Design a protein around this nucleic acid. Structure first.
Ligand code: MG
Ligand code: MG
Ligand code: MG
Ligand code: MG
Ligand code: MG
Ligand code: MG
Ligand code: MG
Ligand code: MG
Ligand code: MG
Ligand code: MG
Ligand code: MG
Ligand code: MG
Ligand code: MG
Ligand code: MG
Ligand code: MG
Ligand code: MG
Ligand code: MG
Ligand code: MG
Ligand code: MG
Ligand code: MG
Ligand code: MG
Ligand code: MG
Ligand code: MG
Ligand code: MG
Ligand code: MG
Ligand code: MG
Ligand code: MG
Ligand code: MG
Ligand code: MG
Ligand code: MG
Ligand code: MG
Ligand code: MG
Lengths: 80, 205, 82, 156, 122, 129
RNA sequence: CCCGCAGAAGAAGCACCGGCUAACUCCGUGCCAGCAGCCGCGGUAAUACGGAGGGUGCAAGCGUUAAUCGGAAUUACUGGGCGUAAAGCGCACGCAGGCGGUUUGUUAAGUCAGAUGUGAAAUCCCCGGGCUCAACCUGGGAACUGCAUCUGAUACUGGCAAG
RNA sequence: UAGCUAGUAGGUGGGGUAACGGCUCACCUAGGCGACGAUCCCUAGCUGGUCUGAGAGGAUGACCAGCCACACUGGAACUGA
């Protein structure tokens, strides 16, 4: 078991790379309402396997570029 | 740090006898105890809620001879301590060393007792204690040292105390001039004229 | 290096030393790795005054920690008393 | 044993052809110290008469209050038009922590340990009315047991 | 009011301006009397109230009341000003301190001497 | 739109008690039935009866004692605009323990006291006094 | 720190007293001089100005000024409101967003439970201990409402599938 | 203050670092950030804590301790773990 996060692929244009929103459903500090917050992450994906809209599991790793410190581990729900 | 003014003046203002005199001579003979001090004594204005609370607090402070900052500290300590706050405050005040000396009878007044304590006449557990605010604890022996044991004031004070009502919470030996502070007094043990509740409200405005 | 030394605490003329493990570079009362005892030089009779967690000290020494001269003296005293 | 105390005395005026007519209103509150409290609002041309009228009114139309060991039965809110009032039971020795009018009403009622606050308007008559209403509505565990058709032990 | 609305745009604390901004959160400040004059009070009062328009060390040109009966002030007279308005001079927000630099203590005062910079008589 | 059926049910109960209605009917749901069951157990209503197959109707029989309503107050707490969840140490005591608080836990809808006894928190549906 | 020496000897002021707010009189002035935190006071009987006597409150300090929170439910999450007091867009349509009737299955994201790790020391609080007492120092606890990971529960909310 | 960015975003390969890395360079791709506030402007050392408050909050960051930055102003490296 390794630490990993799931997220929808917000973009897949930059080659070998995808952007993966990691929406978390946090509670508001004061008002107590539960707000959908988002976390964009530049994820490395070799072979350009991922599509846009694709759900994808990712893990943290040594930084591969200026913005890219995550790698994909497995794709799920990769329908179009 | 001490009130150095007229004492029957304070008593008259309060209404009660605060025991600021030895009690050889009656307060009615020493002053117009009924009438309040000053030009406008022969008048009793209707007292506000704040006023009554303040008067009670003043009475207690005068009785023991504690200035306000010290009194406030006492109140805070009492509040912090578990149980009833007014009761705790009364207990602390009683616990004071000058007060215990007075109760035992090594002084006609608390002013006299305080003087003795300051001047190093009083030993607590065979150790000369000098502070009047010193909290005496249960099972504490408190004694006149020999140099003050020859004092005619001390022996006179003892006689007066014998006349007075003896406290249940102390045990005192007149020949030895030593008393054991067995326990801190309970509210039923202290005087009923004191309305500690007013004081609690005042310091919890 | 890591050392075991006294840190001065208390009031003026009434020192109370906390025995602490700390990187020697750090200031006397500053950053420290572990607090492994205390020492009270004005402590009266019928008071403990000294207390060194000897096991921890042994562990740190094993790791390679130097010991202040005063702390060493304290250790000796503790051993004799016990 | 019917302890009574006057909260507020207020001078009010009427205007007539001649000039102004002054009169006094007295808001008093009586209570037996075991649960019963009642307030009264008297009006007369002079203060003592007004107070007497108020006292008579208060002495009549009292209301019973479920007190648990000299304290409230549960935290209760109360409103009366501007005066919205909150009052909460507190540990023995807390004393009455309550405003003016509120303190009076509670004390005569017989509550020895309460934490109160008056929100909204603090107009004595309305605030007293609010407090009495709140105290009246406050039910006890025997009452809740009766309502729900259980024993008091099942509810606790 | 709606929780969503609050989340969107939370509640603004009511930023209270100071009523003595020339002090600039200082308890007092020094200045030089640009001009010393008397002025008329507001509609429930009649007087000739003594006041001095003063340039402060920090640039501000304020107006300052001069309390006490009589004063030894004139142009180019270095004074200390403190907080406090004359409710009845409109726009006067500061008092001079009697018993400071150029300002003298009040003459022949026996009461509130501390308020008017007067030393204790024998 | 109807956006809160539990709230609607609570409101119906309140209005029925106000208006001295003997019974109150509403579209049945499983959550509603569970809440109703809890209410019956605690004794704030006399009975409930689900009736129908295609679109079933819950019929609650309301409870009166001395001419006045048994359910003195009944407020929704968690609601779609603002969900409320509490932990076992944070579970509320309604009317200082006299009234009950309906809590949806992992082990089904139960009163606050029951939930506390079990040792788990959940969605605080409503207070009832 | 202790012992001795002499002698009440060397040691009390500051503010206030119309209401809020504990404490009142006389004289002087006469909308002047002045006061004032608010409301107000003073135009010839001023408990409000100034002096005196008397009193009240603090006391080696006492007032004033500045500053923050409180009271202030006066930005209202707890905890406000919008017919006439300030406040419903002139009316609609509609994207983002917020919310979502009813049943079953599934997931376990929110939620809940347990554990583990961490949450420096000081500080705060509790029971003790040491300075003659206190302040102050100090032993041990409690707390640090948090965050992370793992293992569960699945009623509710979310996702997915069929109705 | 609604658009900002060309080493800019990503890739391949060299170089460089004690170390990963547009850190740097050549080429390729045309990306990347942004109404969950980018960019721009004003203010500010951060925290344990401190004051206040029943709490939730509000204000604050002297002293003591942890972290950071600076050393007349602006750049630069050398020595060295
Ligand atoms: Mg002092
Ligand atoms: Mg403004
Ligand atoms: Mg006037
Ligand atoms: Mg008065
Ligand atoms: Mg004055
Ligand atoms: Mg005259
Ligand atoms: Mg006169
Ligand atoms: Mg006045
Ligand atoms: Mg006067
Ligand atoms: Mg507020
Ligand atoms: Mg309003
Ligand atoms: Mg309008
Ligand atoms: Mg309209
Ligand atoms: Mg639904
Ligand atoms: Mg949706
Ligand atoms: Mg989960
Ligand atoms: Mg700590
Ligand atoms: Mg001790
Ligand atoms: Mg589900
Ligand atoms: Mg579902
Ligand atoms: Mg490279
Ligand atoms: Mg290379
Ligand atoms: Mg700066
Ligand atoms: Mg800085
Ligand atoms: Mg508050
Ligand atoms: Mg500094
Ligand atoms: Mg540097
Ligand atoms: Mg330098
Ligand atoms: Mg310089
Ligand atoms: Mg340089
Ligand atoms: Mg070297
Ligand atoms: Mg080198």
């Amino acid at each position: 078991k390794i630490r990993t996060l799931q997220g929808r692929v917000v973009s897949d244009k930059m080659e070998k790379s995808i952007v993966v929103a990691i929406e978390r459903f946090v509670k508001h500090p004061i008002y107590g309402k539960f707000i959908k917050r988002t976390t964009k992450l530049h994820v490395h994906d070799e072979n350009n396997e991922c599509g846009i809209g694709d759900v994808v599991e990712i893990r943290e790793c040594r930084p591969l570029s200026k913005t890219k410190s995550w790698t994909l581990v497995r794709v799920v729900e990769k329908a179009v | 740090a001490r009130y150095l003014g007229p004492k029957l003046k304070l008593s008259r203002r309060e209404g009660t006898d605060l025991f600021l005199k030895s009690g050889v001579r009656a307060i009615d003979t020493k002053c117009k105890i009924e009438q309040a001090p000053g030009q406008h004594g022969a008048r009793k204005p209707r007292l506000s809620d704040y006023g009554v609370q303040l008067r009670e607090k003043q009475k207690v402070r005068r009785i023991y001879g504690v200035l306000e900052r010290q009194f406030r500290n006492y109140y805070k300590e009492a509040a912090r301590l578990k149980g009833n706050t007014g009761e705790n405050l009364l207990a602390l005040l009683e616990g004071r060393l000058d007060n215990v000396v007075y109760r035992m009878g090594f002084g006609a007044t608390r002013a006299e007792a305080r003087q003795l304590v300051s001047h190093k006449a009083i030993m607590v557990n065979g150790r000369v204690v000098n502070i009047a605010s010193y909290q005496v604890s249960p099972n504490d022996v408190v004694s006149i040292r020999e140099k003050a044991k020859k004092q005619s004031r001390v022996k006179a004070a003892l006689e007066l105390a014998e006349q007075r009502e003896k406290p249940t919470w102390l045990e005192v030996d007149a020949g030895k001039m030593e008393g054991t502070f067995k326990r801190k007094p309970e509210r039923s043990d202290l005087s009923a004229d004191i309305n500690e509740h007013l004081i609690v409200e005042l310091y919890s405005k | 290096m890591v050392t075991i030394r006294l840190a001065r605490h208390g009031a003026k003329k009434r020192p109370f030393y906390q025995v602490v493990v700390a990187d020697s570079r750090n200031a006397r009362n500053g950053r420290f790795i572990e607090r492994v005892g205390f020492f009270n030089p004005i402590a009266s009779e019928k008071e403990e005054g000294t207390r060194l967690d000897l096991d921890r000290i042994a562990h740190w020494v094993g790791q390679g920690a130097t010991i202040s001269d005063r702390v060493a003296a304290l250790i000796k005293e503790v051993n004799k008393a016990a | 044993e019917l302890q009574e105390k006057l909260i507020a005395v207020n001078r009010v005026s009427k205007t007539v052809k001649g000039g102004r007519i002054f009169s006094f209103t007295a808001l008093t509150v009586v209570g037996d110290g075991n649960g019963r409290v009642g307030f009264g609002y008297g009006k007369a041309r002079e203060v003592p008469a007004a107070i007497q009228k108020a006292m008579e009114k208060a002495r009549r139309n009292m209301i019973n209050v479920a007190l648990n060991n000299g304290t409230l039965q549960h935290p209760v809110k109360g409103v009366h038009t501007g005066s919205r009032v909150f009052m909460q039971p507190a540990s023995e020795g807390t004393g009455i922590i309550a405003g003016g009018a509120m303190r009076a009403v509670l004390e005569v009622a017989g509550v020895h340990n309460v934490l109160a606050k008056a929100y909204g308007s603090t107009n004595p008559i309305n605030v007293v009315r609010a407090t009495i209403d709140g105290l009246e509505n406050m039910n006890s565990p025997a009452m809740v047991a009766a309502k729900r058709g259980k024993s008091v032990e099942e509810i606790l | 009011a709606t929780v969503n609305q609050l989340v969107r745009k939370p509640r603004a604390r009511k930023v209270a301006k100071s009523n003595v901004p020339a002090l600039e959160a200082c308890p007092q400040k020094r200045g030089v009397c640009t001009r010393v004059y008397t002025t008329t009070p507001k509609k429930p009062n009649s007087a000739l109230r003594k006041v001095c328009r003063v340039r402060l060390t920090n640039g501000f040109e304020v107006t300052s009341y001069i309390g006490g009966e009589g004063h030894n002030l004139q142009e180019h007279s270095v004074i200390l000003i403190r907080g406090g308005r004359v409710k009845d001079l409109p726009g006067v927000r500061y008092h001079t301190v009697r018993g400071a630099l150029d300002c003298s203590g009040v003459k022949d005062r026996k009461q509130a001497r501390s308020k008017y910079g007067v030393k204790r008589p024998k | 739109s109807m956006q809160d059926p539990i709230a609607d049910m609570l409101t119906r109960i309140r209005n029925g008690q106000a208006a001295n209605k003997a019974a109150v009917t509403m579209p049945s749901s499983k959550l509603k039935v569970a809440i109703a069951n809890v209410l019956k157990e605690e004794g704030f209503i006399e009975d409930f009866k689900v009736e129908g197959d295609t679109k079933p109707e819950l019929e609650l029989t309301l409870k009166y004692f001395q001419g006045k309503a048994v359910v003195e107050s009944i407020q929704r707490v968690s609601r779609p605009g603002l969900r409320i969840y509490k932990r076992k140490d944070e579970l509320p005591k309604v009317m200082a323990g006299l009234g009950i608080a309906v809590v949806s836990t992992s082990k089904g809808v139960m009163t606050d006291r029951a939930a506390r006894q079990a040792g788990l928190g959940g969605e605080i549906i409503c207070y009832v006094a």
